[PDB]
Amino acid sequence: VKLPLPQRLLHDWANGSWVENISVRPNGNLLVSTSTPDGSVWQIKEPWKDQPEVELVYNFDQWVDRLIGIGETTPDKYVVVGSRFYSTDPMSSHVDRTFAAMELDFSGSANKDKPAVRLIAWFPDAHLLQGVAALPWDRTKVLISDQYLLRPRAAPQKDWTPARGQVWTLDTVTGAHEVVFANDTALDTTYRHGYDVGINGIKIRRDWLYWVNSDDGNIYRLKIDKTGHAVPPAKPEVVAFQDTIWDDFTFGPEHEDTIWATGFNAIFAASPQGKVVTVNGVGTSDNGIMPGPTACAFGRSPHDRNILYVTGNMGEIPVDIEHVHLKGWVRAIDTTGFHF
Numbered sequence: 001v002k003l004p005l006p007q008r009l010l011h012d013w014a015n016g017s018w019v020e021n022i023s024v025r026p027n028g029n030l031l032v033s034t035s036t037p038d039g040s041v042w043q044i045k046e047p048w049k050d051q052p053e054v055e056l057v058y059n060f061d062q063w064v065d066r067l068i069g070i071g072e073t074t075p076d077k078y079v080v081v082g083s084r085f086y087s088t089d090p091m092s093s094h095v096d097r098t099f100a101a102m103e104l105d106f107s108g109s110a111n112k113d114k115p116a117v118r119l120i121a122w123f124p125d126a127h128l129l130q131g132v133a134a135l136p137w138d139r140t141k142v143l144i145s146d147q148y149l150l151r152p153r154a155a156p157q158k159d160w161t162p163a164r165g166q167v168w169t170l171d172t173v174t175g176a177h178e179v180v181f182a183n184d185t186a187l188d189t190t191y192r193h194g195y196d197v198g199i200n201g202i203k204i205r206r207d208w209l210y211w212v213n214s215d216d217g218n219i220y221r222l223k224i225d226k227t228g229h230a231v232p233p234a235k236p237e238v239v240a241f242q243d244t245i246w247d248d249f250t251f252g253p254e255h256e257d258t259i260w261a262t263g264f265n266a267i268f269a270a271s272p273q274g275k276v277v278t279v280n281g282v283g284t285s286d287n288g289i290m291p292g293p294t295a296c297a298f299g300r301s302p303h304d305r306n307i308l309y310v311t312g313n314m315g316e317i318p319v320d321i322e323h324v325h326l327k328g329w330v331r332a333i334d335t336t337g338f339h340f
């Protein structure tokens, strides 16, 4: 109950790199997706070690220049999304009509160490696929959040018109995909927080789709039916508010209802009643030790369930978004004894 919570560094990547999201395997290893300098999945093996091994799993260059989100489907299979991008610059826009979803399959004896990788589907009509979450009652299907520029172009980007946010379903067996929820301002940005996205990370808990909005300070949830469509009247509900640029989040540890969410150079815990507490980073004595957290997930081994593993993409606290020093990293926060 002492804040900030204990934390440690697991690994830094090189200058220019960007770790964007995380899925924890049933065996406890971390799988992290990178946006720059290439779109790859890396594995941190046995992350509870002081100095865990960090190994490239797969570079998805055949189909994409960058990965964004990752999410587990059926056990030890994962969907990643990505696209081509005009450059490796931190401010680069994506190339319109180049988004894709791909699979890493670690299931079965043949794949448990080196996975089988495939293209699931092209998404040329999407804008920017972002976060991935499987339907818990039908895990071969995922929802995928989608929002960024309507007209992304080579630098200098001048028309910053944002596309309205939306949420896809993707059937990873057949490749079929369609938009299941759209046209709500809880999905959108008006650049109240500067250039950014609207809907960003997603998770599904019970029959609720949860997301964070990077522009309006709100964490939202939406009652959904068995195919991901909203139950009428289809109105998002604000779960928590904090004037910070959210990115992604998780529930836990174990079965607990607490939300653990990345914000602006800081990590937050949010109670189901909306009480938000800054637990690490800026606004604690951590100061700027963890610039640009991007996502977070709890350990899955029986001896690290209370450890929150945090991905990030900056090497220093940036002056503004036009002077970002990218550097990918993963840290571990020990949440033991935190409670509301």
Ligand SMILES: *[C@@H]1O[C@H](CO)[C@@H](O[C@@H]2O[C@H](CO)[C@@H](O[C@@H]3O[C@H](CO[C@H]4O[C@H](CO)[C@@H](O)[C@H](O[C@H]5O[C@H](CO)[C@@H](O)[C@H](O)[C@@H]5O)[C@@H]4O)[C@@H](O)[C@H](O)[C@@H]3O)[C@H](O)[C@H]2NC(C)=O)[C@H](O)[C@H]1NC(C)=O
Pocket (backbone or CB within 6 Å): 015, 315, 316, 325
């Ligand atoms: C990866 O990128 C990082 C940048 O994000 C590179 O680190 C920079 O490297 C350059 C070149 O070596 C350094 O530039 C020199 O800075 C000298 C002094 O700079 C002081 O003032 C800075 C003002 O903000 C300050 O950030 C910096 O603090 C750093 O050093 C302290 C010890 O001296 C340390 O206690 C701090 O924690 C921090 O690490 C200095 O106090 C200046 O005299 C020179 O003329 C020259 O300009 C930058 O300072 C480095 N910046 C940082 C943040 O480390 C790094 O080299 C890149 N790696 C590779 C492999 O290229």
Ligand SMILES: C/C1=C\C[C@@H](O)/C(C)=C/CC(C)(C)/C=C/C1
Pocket (backbone or CB within 6 Å): 090, 091, 092, 195, 196, 197, 321, 322, 324
């Ligand atoms: C990596 C950067 C910012 C952090 C990132 O989360 C945001 C806000 C991206 C939006 C964009 C591309 C305009 C800014 C790029 C500099």
Ligand SMILES: [Ca+2]
Pocket (backbone or CB within 6 Å): 020, 130, 200, 201, 247, 248, 294
């Ligand atoms: Ca994100």
Ligand SMILES: [Cl-]
Pocket (backbone or CB within 6 Å): 056, 057, 058, 059
């Ligand atoms: Cl490889």
Ligand SMILES: [Cl-]
Pocket (backbone or CB within 6 Å): 150, 162, 163, 164
């Ligand atoms: Cl639009």
Ligand SMILES: [Cl-]
Pocket (backbone or CB within 6 Å): 137, 206, 207, 225, 226
């Ligand atoms: Cl249901």
Ligand SMILES: [Cl-]
Pocket (backbone or CB within 6 Å): 238, 239, 240, 241, 273, 274
């Ligand atoms: Cl609230």
Ligand SMILES: [Cl-]
Pocket (backbone or CB within 6 Å): 276, 277, 278, 279
């Ligand atoms: Cl606080």
